[PDB]
Design a binder for this molecule. Sequence first.
Ligand SMILES: [Zn+2]
Ligand SMILES: [Zn+2]
Ligand SMILES: [Zn+2]
Ligand SMILES: [Zn+2]
Lengths: 378, 374
Amino acid sequence: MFLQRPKPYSDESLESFFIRVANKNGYGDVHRFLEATKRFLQDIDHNGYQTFPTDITRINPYSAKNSSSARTASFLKLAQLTFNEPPELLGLAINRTNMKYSPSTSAVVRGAEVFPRSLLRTHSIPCCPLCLRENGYASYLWHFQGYEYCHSHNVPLITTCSCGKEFDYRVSGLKGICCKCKEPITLTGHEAACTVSNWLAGHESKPLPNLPKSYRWGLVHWWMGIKDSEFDHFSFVQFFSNWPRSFHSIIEDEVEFNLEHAVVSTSELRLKDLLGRLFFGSIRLPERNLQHNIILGELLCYLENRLWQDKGLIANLKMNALEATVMLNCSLDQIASMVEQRILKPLDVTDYLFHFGDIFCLWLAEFQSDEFNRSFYV
Amino acid sequence: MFLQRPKPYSDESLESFFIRVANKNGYGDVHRFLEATKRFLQDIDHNGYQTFPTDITRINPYSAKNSSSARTASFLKLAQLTFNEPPELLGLAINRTNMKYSPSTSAVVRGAEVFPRSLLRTHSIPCCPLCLRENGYASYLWHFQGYEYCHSHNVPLITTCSCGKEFDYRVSGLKGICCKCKEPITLTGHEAACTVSNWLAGHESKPLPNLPKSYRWGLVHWWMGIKDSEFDHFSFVQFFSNWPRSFHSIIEDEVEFNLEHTSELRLKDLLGRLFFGSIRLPERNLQHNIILGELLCYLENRLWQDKGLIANLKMNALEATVMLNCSLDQIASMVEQRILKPLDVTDYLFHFGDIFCLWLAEFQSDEFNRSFYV
Ligand SMILES: [Zn+2]
Ligand SMILES: [Zn+2]
Ligand SMILES: [Zn+2]
Ligand SMILES: [Zn+2]
């Protein structure tokens, strides 16, 4: 099998890539192209040729249950032999990863952008009938929640055509011709999400900060837990006009509430009981790089400064051997090694034996890194 | 107690900070200030006042046995109480850190710059008396080997004066007046170390790459294991001078010594020195750990060449966690569900053509990922 590469684009999705290859090389559709792709992998002695799907829906590496390792091994072999010039297809596929958010939100990766798994769309993919006729391809941002508006047009994406039927570009082509009435879809102008859709594109909008593509998705899963609802876009804009003093407006509310509503005495207080929501909700977004995770990197500033104010209230919060490992970015064995030789002053892991100012000052002298340290937010 | 901040600098050592305070504010030497400082912590009931040193040698937080957590806890109080405008003292200390190098070298950290533990000077700190008269304070680079020449005057660093006696700023102040002679010290041109110490400082100097301060210092440990000797400043410049074909020139010769010394060949038997000595130096940022990405770019275009020679090189489950940056529990999890294909942990049932395809599918990150060396 000898193919030709179409016009390359760094923002084209994976499902939009196989459609443009089959239309350029004279194939009928994408279903007959993936069937001939499976036939070529059988002839070249591939290990997972029988697991290659013929559907454009499950062509992504996260849809594979156990054959994910043979999926990109099939993707790497096609880029080296079936084209005159080697394309870039591994950077366009959504790969799984072991990276988690706080407290337990899973995440995936696509090249140099770590996507949240919880913000991935799986029911219906929206699209735009303008970019599919001007750019000639589909954006990779159409598969995720949050990119509700088209970024440089001040229009939303479409979900249902004028005759009651939906349009999905994966099953009905990249032109924009719907299934039932075979017409182009009529469109259905704010700023509250046009600021967001410009910012979730990876681009600059003020006052929202300059961050990598992964670390702008990290604010979105966090801010949904703030409202305890779905994402609100205009309150996202107004919240960072007072950055960080709207986040300073939050932590003042959160320590002053749970001291009132403390059920135990002020010496028997725990870190999870005063600040179990704020501190355990910003650790890995996606990592502990406080140079880009500005949430925890600011949270540390409003924790270190007031430590020994108010009789050392914050610096004396009880902690387990469990949540000592969460803050230090270590394991339970390194806690159990520092109770033998007593670098760390004191085993039951779930019995509250430690203090917060003890664990906070241990990080600053024994457990920093080139990203998770005190010297970026200062 | 109530003091004054001097002119604050972005390269002052920590030992120079307790002399520029102790001279200015009416103490006799550095010993008097440390003795006064320890008592102060007793009055405000700090827990580790009894571990606070009266020696300026052991002032750094790695010199503590168990009280390194209470030494920066002693340091987190003085910047808030005993001054007018808070000085930067935690940004000057040499803290420990857990960032292991290749193969097992530990690390220390001073703010946002991580150093090899094996490159710390401990006998006698060389210095430049021209910075000890015009700047008058001690640059933190003087605490480390690899830095031999002063990069601000192109003049060497002194270790033994004209009377056969040494010189150190922790015992002879910051003026430059020695012990035996109490004179100005008589001084002691190259380029090969001059441009390294300009690169070791944190400026842009060619042909040494634009790496960060954590990664400009991760290479000097790596090259001394290559030559297996003391550090030659001449060859460390000329090694980077023909990138990539000087770095590849050892690589294509590493295989030829180890091909002759074919399926029972291993990745530890054929590419064992280049790969296992380059994973974390200090970390896995392939934008700035250029050693792995260029070797991966060498070995991505060598995966199924030579009838798949490099695809047939054997790996364990222990040395697969070194690559994939995971634990042994996730390795045994991929054996039950059978994503990675062949329990004995040190078993040779895993090959390099099998591991590298799994990392492009299930184990990327934002820094240990293919998205830089494309
Ligand atoms: Zn567009
Ligand atoms: Zn229509
Ligand atoms: Zn000088
Ligand atoms: Zn002398």
